[PDB]
Design a protein around this ligand. Structure first.
Ligand SMILES: CNCC[C@@H](O)c1cccc(OCC2CCCCC2)c1
Ligand SMILES: CNCC[C@@H](O)c1cccc(OCC2CCCCC2)c1
Ligand SMILES: CCCCCCCCCCCCCCCC(=O)O
Ligand SMILES: CCCCCCCCCCCCCCCC(=O)O
Ligand SMILES: [Fe+2]
Ligand SMILES: [Fe+2]
Lengths: 503, 503
């Protein structure tokens, strides 16, 4: 949990327009930057929150800005370029809002947004900025130049795809998106071949999940992947002149949450009706196999009201007392472990199927063959969200694991970084006053012996009066103790997701 | 949680017949017994697990045995007398099982059991041993002699009543039992008056709770009481030639848990449809008012299967590996805090009503006006139950509080004592190997300043080879550190509940 109030209201700088750079600034380093940390931290966020006099209204509306902290020769540089999407380019041309964003209608004076403000990920030897639509944007990871717009609909049958693809060690990319049978399609993009042809052209649908409602797909933000299984969590947040995307969402009050598994290698949906209470879900933490069971660790929001309702820029820019009051009736954040039995015997009707020795999660087989789940709670703090989770993905993604790292939200305001032992429930916190960190990204020591041998990187906004406005923070993953800090003399807005590109 | 295995199987001594005493043994004291600890610890449990060659089958079937540890003049005595119930007296006369018990049918060769093996409580200046039927037994707290059988049905309209009445500071007794409209009646017994007439003769029904099923009442074990409110939790464990009580129980798979409030002083049921997921509930921990909300702390079992299924004597007497295996598919124990809003505005339909600052419990108002609850988990350990909860009842019962004490069950085997801070979730544990404690009872220091200024008393069975077989354990409530121990040279079976009678 957090240990601060924010009466000074410095978090407002997260939601303030900035200018791009012509070329990289040098950052001033305090501490020793590890010699083995060579590469680029790339992150996406909104950078332009109005077009002239026309405001963007929602957190997910501001125009995509690609950021890079570069570690070479012990020195550190910062660079940022707006992504030259159709949304951004037409806005610059017409000097107004041309494309409708998540929570802002453009008025003429369905063109789907390609405002790729959410994440960046590798396909083959390319990198793509994304949002959650059919449009992803190829970008240059060195120069931050925009290369091209790609429309997934040219290749596969999806209406969109998440900003949270899973990537296997061989470069194979999995993702999920809404489609028509309404269903949800798992997309697979292969690694780059010898033939060197663009892997996107080899995309295919490998498996389809059914939808709880004939005409209304659930919003899907992420999903789980293990070596053998795909996990999809179907939540009660449903998609139904001048409307935006937000206006189409509604809450199904009666369905609760439906959980779904598919055999990855046999490409089969499994007909197990996993059921539980209502929650929002944005981020899976990790998923893994333990005997005949899937362990499904989730960042939940307890409630069926759409949490994005609380993320309009006007509300996030209020003073601190009003921000707390605004969150009073929001869903409560909670890290939960669910355990899904794979080997279900009808003889166990009426009983708890979760026979594992080290969990309190349950799964009750009912007579109608629904399997009713209760979670093991891993972390719970009043309006203190463990969110934007990251793990040692390369080695522990899809596998038995012990540690997650997260961004701590205090009434939706990011004000700390956290580490969670998912087995013992012990936590560690890094926090300084009037400091607003980003999602922590884990980078493994090249000679790691243990899961947490490495560092986490976070971009911190520190708007205090006698302060460099922002800095790249490097923590030791062991205990979240500070290793170094690379300060810059310009503001940095909120960033959502990214990656560390080793070189 | 527990830190032990029990391969020696000493816990079997909990379920072994003992003989009563003709008069009190002196206990050998190690440590200093607090000078202020003057009075009697009275506890009830089964003491006779077979009648000749006929076995009792269930944990709740053995014949009631009243125990007393007496603290006078620094010395400590132990005494026990079987309660002379109809069940016990007719069994001794006919030398067989005459009355049907919870899980043992008597074969001739509805007489409702009066085997008061569960608890003892004060009414006026009298003490009554009870089970959960209409028959309670007046007993002599000094000599442990049986005085009379009392039939509640002579006085009030209940088919039975729990062994967990609430007692107000003025001696007013509240209880709950099944009745016919099927409903649940709150019974109130006043304090002793000047007129000196037996308070039971002044019993009345003050309020009635509705039942979820026309013909099937839920099993009720306890309930919540605050100065202003009564809380009843309606669980999916339902009551439907040679049958016993256990044979009548079944699980409702679809209803979940229904929670109910009544205004205590206005004697009104409140028509708020509080709803949540399925669990068994035996023990409320404490209940209190916090602004427009009720805080409801519960010892839950996650699942709808009846937990009493796992408590047959044959299963509890198995060797340790089999005991663990037997519990694998049992409901998982979990301490949960629920928060019930009293002031519900229809304008908040679809949102979380729990606006308190220091909880993660939620309550969602739905369009059909059901209020869907999620808990804040206070304690959760794999098959490690925090059970038989006790608090500083006199001063903190029905009121804001911080501490609970419990018996720790390891796959249903009692093997430790626990203290829980319900606000911070910190725990403390007392445990020794091959030692099987009872419910801890809290006794306040007569000059207490803080909630945990006092001691807890627990009867410990220690069957090891070079060991006194049993002892009264006194812990400091601050940290569960040992203060003293009063050893006896005979076995003591399992005891469920009791009280400390100051004198
Ligand atoms: C963290 N960003 C959340 C909102 C944003 O990505 C976004 C922006 C614009 C449209 C969106 O929804 C796309 C839609 C999803 C359902 C299938 C059809 C496309 C989503
Ligand atoms: C911890 N003891 C639990 C079982 C025991 O008290 C018991 C023993 C015999 C009959 C019982 O149920 C009584 C019944 C409850 C429902 C209303 C009618 C009486 C209950
Ligand atoms: C610094 C990060 C953002 C802080 C302010 C917004 C808080 C977001 C809380 C909701 C959960 C996250 C859902 C969106 C995740 C995403 O952008 O991919
Ligand atoms: C030493 C105490 C009993 C230990 C063995 C039985 C474990 C009981 C676990 C179930 C929860 C308690 C329900 C019955 C409570 C009661 O007797 O009033
Ligand atoms: Fe995300
Ligand atoms: Fe009890």
């Amino acid at each position: 949990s957090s240990q601060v109030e924010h009466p000074a209201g410095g978090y407002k700088k997260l939601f303030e327009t900035v200018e791009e750079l012509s070329s990289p600034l040098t950052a001033h380093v305090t501490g020793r930057i590890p010699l083995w940390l060579t590469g680029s931290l790339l992150r996406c966020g909104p950078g332009l929150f109005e077009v002239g006099s026309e405001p963007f209204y929602h957190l997910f509306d501001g125009q995509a800005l690609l950021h890079k902290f570069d570690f070479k020769e012990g020195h550190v540089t910062y660079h940022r370029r707006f992504i030259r999407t159709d949304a951004y380019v037409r806005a610059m041309t017409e000097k107004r809002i041309v494309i409708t964003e998540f929570g802002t209608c453009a008025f003429p004076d369905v063109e789907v947004t390609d405002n790729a403000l959410v994440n960046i990920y590798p396909v083959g030897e390319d990198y793509y900025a994304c949002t959650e639509t059919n449009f992803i944007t190829k970008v240059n990871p060195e120069t931050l130049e925009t290369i091209k717009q790609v429309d997934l609909c040219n290749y596969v049958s999806v209406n969109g795809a998440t900003a949270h693809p899973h990537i296997e060690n061989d470069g194979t990319v999995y993702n999920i998106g809404n489609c028509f049978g309404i269903a949800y399609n798992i997309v697979k993009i292969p690694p780059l071949q010898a033939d060197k042809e663009d892997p996107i052209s080899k995309s295919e649908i490998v498996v389809q999940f059914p939808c709880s409602d004939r005409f209304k797909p659930s919003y899907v933000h992420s999903f789980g992947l293990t070596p053998n299984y795909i996990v999809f969590v179907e939540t009660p947040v449903k998609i139904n002149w001048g409307a935006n995307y937000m206006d189409c969402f509604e809450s199904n009050e009666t369905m609760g949450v439906w959980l779904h598994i598919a055999d990855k290698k046999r490409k089969k949906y499994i007909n197990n009706k996993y059921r539980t209470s209502p929650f929002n879900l944005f981020h899976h933490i990790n998923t893994y196999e333990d005997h005949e069971f899937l362990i499904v660790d989730l960042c939940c929001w307890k409630g069926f009201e759409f949490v994005y309702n609380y993320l309009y820029l006007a509300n996030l820019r209020e003073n601190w007392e009003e921000v707390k009051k605004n969150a009073r009736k929001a869903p409560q954040p909670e890290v939960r472990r669910y355990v899904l039995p794979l080997n279900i015997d009808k003889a166990d009707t009426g009983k708890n199927l979760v026979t594992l020795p080290n969990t309190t999660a349950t799964a009750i087989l009912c007579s109608d063959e629904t399997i009713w789940l209760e979670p093991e709670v891993l972390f719970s703090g009043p309006r203190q969200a463990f969110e934007f989770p990251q793990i040692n993905y390369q080695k522990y993604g899809g596998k038995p694991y012990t540690y997650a790292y997260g961004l701590g939200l205090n009434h939706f305001v990011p004000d700390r970084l956290c580490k969670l032992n998912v087995k013992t429930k012990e936590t560690w916190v890094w926090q300084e006053p009037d400091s607003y960190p980003s999602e922590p990204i884990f980078v493994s020591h090249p000679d790691a012996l243990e899961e947490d041998d490495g560092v986490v990187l976070s971009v911190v906004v520190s708007p205090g009066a006698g302060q460099k406005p922002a800095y790249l923070l490097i923590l030791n993953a062991k205990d979240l103790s500070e290793v170094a800090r690379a300060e810059v003399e310009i503001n940095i807005p909120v960033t959502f997701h990214g990656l560390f590109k080793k070189s």
